[PDB]
Amino acid sequence: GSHSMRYFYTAMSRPGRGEPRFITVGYVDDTLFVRFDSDATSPRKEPRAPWIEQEGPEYWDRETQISKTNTQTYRENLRTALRYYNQSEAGSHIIQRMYGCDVGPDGRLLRGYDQYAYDGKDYIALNEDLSSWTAADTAAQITQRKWEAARVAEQDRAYLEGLCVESLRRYLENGKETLQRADPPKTHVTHHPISDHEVTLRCWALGFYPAEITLTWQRDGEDQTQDTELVETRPAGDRTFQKWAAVVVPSGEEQRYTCHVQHEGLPKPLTLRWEP
């Protein structure tokens, strides 16, 4: 299928408690493969998936240097953000960045990203054209002017079209047993009386990868969006994910209800019922 690679940066100030912590995590799809933490005893890029352990010493040296340089760069960004928002140096703030690329089944670039946030709000983002920016406010516009002058977009584009897709294609090949395997959900419906009058039907999906999934209930063929309790897709700890959908149904009306499951590991969508 299609695939993504993303790096997520978090830079967190903490006045009175040393210098801002800088974290990086890298993902292929929903698989974490690399991490860096400036708070680590000896900060370095560390492998988090078997297939990346293949990369040579030079890869780990270069990757570590990027993150080490980033720790300093992002400390400067935090100081600058404080100025741009007329903020005092007593408070703690956060800069985040997501960047990377999506490829199709043939490995061609689908689209690239380079997005930034400050205190959990949009700051600045490379547009899908990979040649212009969207600034969220007048502060980000200052950054925008700087990056337009420095032709940053052009240089991002070069990375996104080249090394981003080149490395992802190599990673996809090296981790082909896992990154190119979808695990379908294991599914069942449980039945829990809530009173004489109502019972909960819970539709479970367990053991699935990647995390993307759709679980819905219908009553007599109609979607029960408003009356369905749907928990956030959650990690199991074994690479796989879990989700459930619950509906409260009138006593005796259980068979009017069907659960519907969409996931890329299923060749076709499943329809589930309570099986007393």
Partner: peptide, 9 residues
Amino acid sequence: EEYLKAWTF
């Protein structure tokens, strides 16, 4: 693989 390049805010 990460992008080397870093310009500031």
